[PDB]
A and B are shown apart, each in its own frame.
With several copies, the nearest count.
Chain A
Amino acid sequence: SKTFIKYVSGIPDYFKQSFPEGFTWERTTTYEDGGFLTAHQDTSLDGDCLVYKVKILGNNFPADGPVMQNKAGGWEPGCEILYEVDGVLCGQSLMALKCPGGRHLNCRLHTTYRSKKPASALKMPEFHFEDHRIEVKEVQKGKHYEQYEAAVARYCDAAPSKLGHH
């Protein structure tokens, strides 16, 4: 839900800038055990309501893996890198799924974010990071879930530059 990000240090907000038109995103997530999860999403503004429409295709998840065995323990917090490619915004991230026995299963997210506004009408952000944290509670088995996420967009303040870069 890319509209809900705290942007610091004056980084342009590609997603909020896109309204009222909205934006789309497309992603393939590659899992280290051979699974793939591909998604396309449309984000629109219907007056005072945001409308998300998502299409999902997932495949090759091992039958004995934590995904198909339904033994996943949620995601670790993650960092995404974002930068312009071909006049749109690209995103790249690694995530880690918590597994039984204190193990992790990693994956890579390959994302392109596409504004429905033309590039000429937008202020494109420079290379930056988005910190994310996703938390899930299963209310009813395989039926009802609740999900929380916090997200911040920033430069690298933690490790400072000598060359005066961001």
Chain B
Amino acid sequence: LTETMPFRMTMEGTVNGHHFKCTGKGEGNPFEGTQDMKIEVIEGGPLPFAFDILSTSC
């Protein structure tokens, strides 16, 4: 690993019958336990539900 690690993400799902896709990328300090990222809804946007339910999956 490194002092700062980058990451990328792809996400697909269905919530209450609504299909969506998300992508993301970010960075963090693995040993300090901090991180930041951007998430874009690429399919099924604008999200018809609170994004908060996806936070722990991102």
Interface set of A (CB-CB < 8 Å, partner B): 1, 3-6, 16, 19, 24, 26-27, 29, 35, 37, 39-41, 48-61, 66-72, 74-75, 95, 97, 109, 112, 114, 134, 136, 138-139, 141-153, 159
Contact = CB atoms under 8 A, between A and B. Distances in A.
Q: How large is the interface on B (under 10, 10 to 19, 20 to 34, 35 or more residues)?
A: 35 or more
A144 B11 contact: no
B39 A50 contact: no
B39 A147 contact: yes
Contacts, number: 183
Interface in B5-58: 5-17, 22, 24, 26, 28-41, 45-58
Interface of B: 1-2, 5-17, 22, 24, 26, 28-41, 45-58
A1 B55 contact: no
* Chain A binding surface SS class: strand
Nearest to A51: B8
Contact of B57 (A54, A59, A69, A146): A54
Question: Could you say which of A5, A27, A74, A141 has the most chain B C-beta atoms within 10 Å of its C-beta?
Answer: A5
Contacts of A145: 38-41, 51
Question: Could you say which of B9, B15, B29, B40 has the most chain A C-beta atoms within 10 Å of its C-beta?
Answer: B15
Contacts of A39: 13, 56-57
A139 B10 CA distance: 19
Contacts of B51: 136, 138, 142, 145
